[PDB]
């Protein structure tokens with residue numbers, strides 16, 4: 469049942485960026501595949517396990533909303549192969565290239581986001597990292613979550629960070645709801661078309677700010693065609709207090725009912 | 733890990749049809765899912781092994797062109813769950829609903845169903861059964877290959893059967909080329925929009941005639957839009973003789989080649 473590709477069957481084309489312990493390419497294997505490579509010479513004992521970690525988590529993910537893991541390879545550097553997806557990251561669509569997504573399916577993006585998030589959590593999986601960078605879009609039609617570099621059972625990306633986790637507490641800040649906050653940011657991003665804490669400029673300050681209970685996100689700005697129960701859902705999820713947040717086995721269920729209403 | 737879905741987590745709506753040793757349903761499990769159930773009250777020891785062999789096959793196919801196997805269920809009927817695809821099987825689109833697919837992408841359907849078929853051949857998988865009834869189409873894009881109920885290491889769907897296999901010879905007629913042959917009929921189906929030998933009506937005479945190499949499929953039927961290189965490929969795959977047929981690694985790259993000579 470080895471999901472390792474027999475030596476050198478993979479091709480690798482140009483770089484597309486970076487991420488969590490690697491680099492990404494538009495390589496070939498039985499078709500088009502997205503591939504993460506080490507890009508290092510020798511493997512660290514901690515990196516060894518960081519690789520072997522992401523493998524065992526992705527091996528658990530057979531789902532139509534989770535980036536389909538296809539194979540791995542320790543020979544010729546450490547590598548992770550998934551399905552290639554035509555289109556771009558949700559971050560690009562929203563902030564880099566400014567795509568005016570229509571509400572009808574602007575919520576359908578959030579649907580599929582939770583569709584997969586529910587699957588992960590119910591199957592023990594934590595995402596930790598999250599972001600809307602990791603919401604890779606298939607054809608502008610199917611949502612797939614990728615890069616499980618920080619998942620379980622020194623640079624960062626402060627924004628999709630639960631205050632509790634920003635503080636640093638007890639070796640175990642990351643939890644179910646710690647994903648749900650980061651997801652709440654994604655909902656917000658869709659509803660606003662821009663990043664949280666936009667009009668400032670001090671990354672270092674934000675860390676302390678939200679991580680102490682000051683810089684709550686500005687709900688009062690968002691596209692006016694937003695549902696009345698959506699603000700309610702963005703609010704419930706982005707809530708500062710930990711256990712006060714709602715779990716995914718009720719997030720999407722509260723969404724797929726509101727998807728019925730706005731059509732008119 | 734064990735793709736066993738804990739009993740009663742699944743849900744099952746109206747029927748979709750039959751085939752492959754059960755009954756097909758649109759269901760729910762972290763979202764929409766295609767479900768093949770047993771329906772039988774007491775499971776057969778010959779079926780028991782037919783089920784488990786099917787699941788052992790699906791356990792090795794993480795591909796964008798193979799119907800993403802999601803899980804199974806032994807408790808409360810024997811069941812298999814896989815990704816739902818809004819939009820129908822090709823057999824319908826082509827012979828039942830008669831959708832007017834343009835050549836630009838008619839070959840793009842063919843490229844994918846080879847893209848997929850190559851992967852299995854390479855990863856040890858023989859399909860045995862290979863219908864246009866099995867080629868499930870994701871809306872208008874993404875070709876994903878159907879169930880493996882037969883696929884290995886009373887109702888027969890003749891038409892997509894290599895002469896050698898219609899005959900029966902040595903308990904071992906099903907092979908690589910066998911899959912390739914039936915794929916060629918799928919090519920014929922695409923290029924004609926018609927079933928093979930559609931202008932007779934004696935199933936139990938086609939069986940003999942093709943089985944003894946008298947009833948060759950009519951190549952002089954394909955549309956005018958069809959490429960000259962394509963008609964060559966169909967013929968090479970619809971070769972009566974076993975060893976004369978070309979293997980998938982070759983087929984795929986041969987179609988890839990010709991696909992970017994069409995645009996004009």
Ligand SMILES: O/N=C1\CCc2cc(-c3cn(C4CCNCC4)nc3-c3ccncc3)ccc21
Pocket residue numbers: 484485486487490491492502503504548549550551552553554555556557560604614615616
């Ligand atoms: O294991 N790590 C992996 C596996 C697949 C994978 C893909 C990416 C990835 C990075 N980008 C770009 C987009 C442009 N701006 C900079 C980032 N796009 C993708 C991508 C992924 C899947 N399908 C299509 C595209 C990153 C990491 C990993």
Ligand SMILES: O/N=C1\CCc2cc(-c3cn(C4CCNCC4)nc3-c3ccncc3)ccc21
Pocket residue numbers: 748749750751752756766767768812813814815816817821824865868878879880
């Ligand atoms: O494991 N084998 C499986 C699992 C699910 C599964 C579904 C089908 C299947 C049979 N049909 C009909 C439809 C009416 N016309 C004749 C064919 N439609 C589907 C179908 C495919 C994908 N998504 C939803 C439904 C076949 C096999 C298997």
